[PDB]
Paper text:
Rv0315 is a secreted protein of Mtb, and the signal peptide is cleaved by a signal peptidase before the mature protein is released. Rv0315 can induce dendritic cell (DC) maturation and activation via the activation of MAPK and NF-κB signaling, and it participates in adaptive immunity by inducing T cell immune responses toward T-helper 1 (Th1) polarization via antigen-presenting DCs23. The overall structure of Rv0315 reveals that the protein adopts a sandwich-like β-jelly-roll fold, formed by the face-to-face packing of two antiparallel sheets, which is typical of GH16 enzymes. However, our enzymatic activity assay showed that Rv0315 is actually an inactive β-glucanase that is ineffective for the degradation of 1,3-β-glucans, such as laminarin, and has no activity toward 1,3–1,4-β-glucans, such as β-D-glucan from barley.
The crystal is monoclinic (C121), and its asymmetric unit contains two chains of Rv0315 (designated as chains A and B), and a total of 681 water molecules. Each monomer is composed of 241 amino acids (54–294). The final model of Rv0315 has been refined to Rwork of 18.4% and Rfree of 21.4%. The overall structure comprises 16 β-strands forming two twisted β-sheets, two short a-helices and one calcium ion. The calcium ion binding site is well conserved in GH16 enzymes and has been suggested to be important for protein stability. The β-sheets twist and bend, forming a substrate binding concavity. Two conserved glutamates in the pattern EXDX(X)E are catalytic residues28 in the GH16 family proteins; in Rv0315, Glu-171 is equivalent to the catalytic nucleophile, whereas Glu-176 is the general acid-base catalyst. Rv0315 has a larger cavity than that of the ZgLamAGH16 structure; this large cavity is not present in other known structures of the GH16 family laminarinases. All of these residues related to subsites −2 and −3 were not conserved in Rv0315 and could not form any direct interactions with the substrate. Given all of these differences, polysaccharides may not be able to firmly bind to the cleft of Rv0315 because of its large cavity and the lack of key residues to fix the β-glucans, leading to a lack of detectable catalytic activity for Rv0315.
Residue numbers in the entry: 54 to 241, 246 to 297
C-alpha cells in the first residue's frame, strides 16, 4: 500500500542489521584542518562490530557508544536503498544517549558527485553548546542550509519528513491533522538559492548514527559508556 522500504529490525540479539538493507560503517572520515574536538584524540571512530551496532532481539536496532582504553567507538548504518521525491520517511527512535560526548542523528543523504545534499531530521549535540534540531543542507559544505531547533527528550518518538515537489515538511510524533513543526519550501532572486532536491532523478538514502566526539559531540573523555540510540523501525512511503 505505498510502502517503498522498511526495516522493522526483527532478529536475534547480537546479530548484524539486515545486510541487504544496511551497510555498517567501519570508518569515520577524519576532519580536514581539525580544531577543538574534531582533533583525532577526541574523534570517536565507527566500527563494524556487534559491540557497537547490533539488533537487541527485541526488534530494535542498537547503536552503542563504547570505550576501550582511550579509544572511543560509536556506530553508523547507511541504507542501501535510495528514494526520490514524493516520499515520506519516518523512524521510531529512543535516545538513551543524551549525554556529553554523544552526537546522535537520523538523516537522509545524497552523495551524487557535484550535487550532494543532506536532510537532517534530528540531531542532538553532546557538546553542551549547540541546540538540538532539524536541518536541510543543499550543499555538502554547510553553507546552504535551513535549520530549526526542536527539543529532544529520552522517550520513544517518531521523526518524519515528507519530501514532495513543493518542499520538505517535518513532524515529531505525526498524527492526522497536526501541522509540521518545520517547513522548507522548494525554490520557486539573485543570488539564486541553492536547491538540488527538485532535480530530475535526485534520490536520498537513510542514515542512523551515534557519533562519539567531534565538534558536535564534545569531549568524549567526559562521556559515559555505554550510551545507546534505539531504533524500533524505519519506514518509507511513496505518494501516488
Ligand atoms: Ca521493531
Amino acid at each position: 500500500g505505498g510502502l517503498l522500504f522498511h526495516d522493522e529490525f526483527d532478529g536475534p540479539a547480537g546479530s548484524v542489521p539486515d545486510p541487504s538493507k544496511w551497510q555498517v560503517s567501519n570508518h569515520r572520515t577524519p576532519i580536514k584542518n581539525p580544531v577543538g574536538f574534531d582533533r583525532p584524540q577526541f574523534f570517536g571512530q565507527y566500527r563494524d562490530s556487534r559491540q557497537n551496532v547490533f539488533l537487541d532481539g527485541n526488534s530494535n536496532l542498537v547503536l552503542r557508544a563504547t570505550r576501550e582504553g582511550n579509544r572511543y567507538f560509536g556506530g553508523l548504518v547507511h541504507g542501501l536503498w535510495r528514494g526520490g521525491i514524493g516520499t515520506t520517511w519516518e523512524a521510531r527512535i529512543k535516545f538513551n544517549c543524551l549525554a556529553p560526548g554523544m552526537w546522535p542523528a537520523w538523516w537522509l543523504s545524497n552523495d551524487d558527485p557535484g550535487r550532494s545534499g543532506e536532510i537532517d531530521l534530528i540531531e542532538w549535540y553532546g557538546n553542551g553548546t549547540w541546540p538540538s534540531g532539524t536541518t536541510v543542507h543543499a550543499n555538502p559544505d554547510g553553507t546552504a542550509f535551513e535549520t530549526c531547533p526542536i527539543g529532544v527528550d529520552g522517550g520513544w518518538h517518531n521523526w518524519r519528513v515528507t519530501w514532495n515537489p513543493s518542499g520538505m515538511y517535518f513532524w515529531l510524533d505525526y498524527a492526522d491533522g497536526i501541522e509540521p513543526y518545520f517547513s522548507v519550501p522548494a525554490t520557486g532572486n539573485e543570488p539564486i538559492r541553492e536547491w538540488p532536491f527538485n532535480d530530475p532523478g535526485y534520490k536520498v538514502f537513510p542514515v542512523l548514527n551515534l557519533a562519539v566526539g567531534g565538534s558536535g559531540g564534545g569531549d568524549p573523555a567526559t562521556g559515559s559508556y555505554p550510551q545507546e540510540m534505539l531504533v524500533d523501525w524505519v519506514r518509507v512511503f511513496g505518494s501516488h
